[PDB]
Amino acid sequence: KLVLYTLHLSPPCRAVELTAKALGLELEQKNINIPVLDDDGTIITESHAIMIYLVTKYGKDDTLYPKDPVQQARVNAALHFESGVLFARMRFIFERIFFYGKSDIPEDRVEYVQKSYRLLEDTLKDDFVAGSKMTIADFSCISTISSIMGVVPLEQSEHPRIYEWIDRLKQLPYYEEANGGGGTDLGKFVLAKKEENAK
Amino acid sequence: KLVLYTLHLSPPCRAVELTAKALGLELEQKNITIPVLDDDGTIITESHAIMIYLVTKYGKDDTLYPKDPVQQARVNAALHFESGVLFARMRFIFERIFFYGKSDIPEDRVEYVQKSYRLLEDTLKDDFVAGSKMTIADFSCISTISSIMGVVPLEQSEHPRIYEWIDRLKQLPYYEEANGGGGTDLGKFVLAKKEENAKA
């Protein structure tokens, strides 16, 4: 069976949890002593690689990660947008607060994230980030957005496509448990730590 | 035929060129979010997705991108290492110099890049980034490293594995044309731009 070494506050861990639930898989989650998957002794690391692996090994169809090279290319592109832009820019803010005891968020880092929101809005021409169907790229993207939006405000009037997209994902029965709670809490924890650092 | 809208200075563009050369493919490059591949009407975008697409369509074996889910997972992880860590941290530095007229590189961004160097050194337990065999993840990582190492010094004594891996890649007949020249020139262009910015 599938063991996940994980922290629920962690966005890439939640991206995997979302994936495991969409595949109908049960995850035994373990705290560290991320994410790291133990599939029967075989160790898989890095959230995107894990998600691809899980769909490849355990998907009964390929809707979450297509076999067709062209369709698959669009999901792959979206996965790298998440790692290269969405996650990278959030981490640029969070790390300074979490590990280096800083209390300020530099203005240009807020702006870098605000720009990533506009890029995301632009990609949401269809209902989901890689096209008309929901894929693991949506899981990767929402695990990050649901965390950072509690820190760098994501304006409803300026991002209608993103809120519709979030509302779609919130219609998944497993959304709140696999992702929503943890992402909301990660935002609150960043804000609490930011304030604590200044004391 | 394969058409690539591209800029040779761009790391993700060079990662694709290395891939095309390794597959024995010819590319028609057009000067322009890049690169964009036009494969007989089929439009693929984003370098990692292009690379996987090309190996999938035109690969004669699965060396560059394995069919084995576990091995493929190692390559996938290294690809996202390149996108989320190496490239992103390079961009945090270059954008400031290119678009905002800055001449300094903040100390924390330098260390951020040097930390990515340590992580890469750590992953090179075998000869290549995803193991003992060369893959498109090597092409992705080297396209970025060959550019940033000209700006944020990568010390030999502290990164022997990186210098060994680089020397291995330099043994590829197509390395210098597809990547080496453009990565070195991007680095020099960054330094030149940085100096110019400080001059009133």
Numbering used by the authors:
A (entry chain C): 3 to 35, 55 to 220
B (entry chain A): 3 to 34, 54 to 221
Excerpt from the publication:
To identify the structural changes responsible for the higher activity in the resistant GSTe2 Benin allele (119 F), its X-ray three-dimensional structure was determined and analyzed in comparison with that of a L119-GSTe2 susceptible allele cloned from Uganda (UG-GSTe2). Overall, the structure of BN-GSTe2 and UG-GSTe2 are very similar. However, significant local differences can be observed between the alleles at the C-terminal ends of H4 (containing the L119F mutation; residues from 113 to 128) and H8 (residues from 213 to 220). These differences can be described as a concerted movement of the BN-GSTe2 H4 and H8 helices with respect to those of UG-GSTe2, which opens the active site cleft. Leu119 normally forms part of the solvent-inaccessible hydrophobic core that stabilizes the conformation of helices H4, H5 and H8 of Uganda-GSTe2. However, to accommodate the bulkier Phe119 side chain in the Benin-GSTe2 structure, the N-terminal end of H4 has a dramatic bend, which increases the size of the H-site in comparison to the UG allele, where the cavity is tighter. The H-site surface representation of both proteins with a bound GSH confirms that the resistant BN allele has a larger putative DDT cavity than the susceptible UG allele. An assessment of the DDT dehydrochlorinase activity of the recombinant 119 F resistant enzyme (Benin) and that of susceptible L119 revealed that the 119 F allele is 3.4 times more efficient at metabolizing DDT (82.9% DDT depletion after 1 hr reaction in the presence of the cofactor glutathione (GSH); P < 0.001) than the L119 allele (24.4% depletion). This is confirmed by their respective kinetic parameters, with the 119 F allele having a higher catalytic efficiency (kcat/Km ratio) for DDT (316.3 μM−1.s−1 vs 92.0 μM−1.s−1). Overall, these structural analyses demonstrate that the L119F mutation is the causative mutation that confers DDT resistance.
Using genome-wide transcriptional and functional analyses combined with structural and population genetics studies, we conclusively demonstrated that a single amino acid change in the binding pocket of the glutathione-s-transferase epsilon 2 (GSTe2) gene, coupled with increased transcription, confers a high level of DDT resistance and also cross-resistance to pyrethroids in the major African malaria vector An. funestus. The topology of GSTe2 indicates that the 221 amino acids of the An. funestus GSTe2 (afGSTe2) are divided into two distinct domains similar to that of An. gambiae (92% similarity between the two species, with a difference of 20 amino acids). The active site is located in a deep cleft formed at the interface of the two domains, specifically by the interaction of H1 and H3 from the N-terminal domain and H4, H6 and H8 from the C-terminal domain. The active site of GSTe2 can be divided into two sub-sites.
